[PDB]
Amino acid sequence: MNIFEMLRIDEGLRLKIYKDTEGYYTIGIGHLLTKSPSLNAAKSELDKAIGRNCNGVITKDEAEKLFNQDVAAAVRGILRNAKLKPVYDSLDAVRECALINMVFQMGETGVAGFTNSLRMLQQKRWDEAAVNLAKSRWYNQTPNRAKRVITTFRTGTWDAYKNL
Ligand SMILES: [Cl-]
Numbered sequence: 001m002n003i004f005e006m007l008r009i010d011e012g013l014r015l016k017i018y019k020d021t022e023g024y025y026t027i028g029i030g031h032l033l034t035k036s037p038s039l040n041a042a043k044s045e046l047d048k049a050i051g052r053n054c055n056g057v058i059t060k061d062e063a064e065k066l067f068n069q070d071v072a073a074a075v076r077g078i079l080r081n082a083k084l085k086p087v088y089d090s091l092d093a094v095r096e097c098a099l100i101n102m103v104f105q106m107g108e109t110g111v112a113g114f115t116n117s118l119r120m121l122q123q124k125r126w127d128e129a130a131v132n133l134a135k136s137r138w139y140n141q142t143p144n145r146a147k148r149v150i151t152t153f154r155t156g157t158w159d160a161y162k163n164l
């Protein structure tokens with residue numbers, strides 16, 4: 001298990017534009033296209049992302065291309081974010097994956113807002129952090145995915161993903 005396998009479990013793979021858990025147009029492995037309700041706006045974003053005439057459909061290789069961009073950019077953005085960088089650097093490589101997962105799902109700014117949980121993580125107060133992380137819209141709206149991510153933070157193991 002690694003970050004790619006983890007997010008592939010959590011996000012799935014779809015080759016046609018679809019609506020994510022929040023109702024937003026998405027494709028591939030959790031590649032958010034737009035929050036607009038206009039499918040045409042989503043289709044324009046897609047063509048621009050891939051560099052061709054897709055009208056809503058991509059290949060697996062293309063989906064994987066966007067996914068590695070998105071993971072790379074999540075890591076890079078964490079390391080440029082003054083709130084998230086110290087926490088990332090303080091964490092072991094398994095727990096880092098949980099942080100990348102959260103940023104992938106809810107964006108940098110959203111994760112950086114978990115001030116109290118981030119402090120508990122940097123303090124290595126794992127069960128306290130886990131309790132705090134669950135007190136969130138995040139957890140309420142996607143509780144099974146959040147449980148998996150939280151278990152990864154709490155334990156530093158892949159127990160919540162091994163054989164998914
Ligand atoms: Cl439209």
Ligand SMILES: [Cl-]
Pocket residue numbers: 049
């Ligand atoms: Cl993009």
Ligand SMILES: [Cl-]
Pocket residue numbers: 124125126127128129
């Ligand atoms: Cl604790």
Ligand SMILES: [Cl-]
Pocket residue numbers: 128131132135
């Ligand atoms: Cl709490």
Ligand SMILES: [Cl-]
Pocket residue numbers: 141142143144145146
């Ligand atoms: Cl869920």
Ligand SMILES: [Rb+]
Pocket residue numbers: 010011012020021030
């Ligand atoms: Rb998804």
Ligand SMILES: [Rb+]
Pocket residue numbers: 030031032104105
């Ligand atoms: Rb996403």
Ligand SMILES: [Rb+]
Pocket residue numbers: 037038039
């Ligand atoms: Rb729509």
Ligand SMILES: [Rb+]
Pocket residue numbers: 088089090091092093
């Ligand atoms: Rb580290």
Ligand SMILES: [Rb+]
Pocket residue numbers: 112113114115
């Ligand atoms: Rb905050």
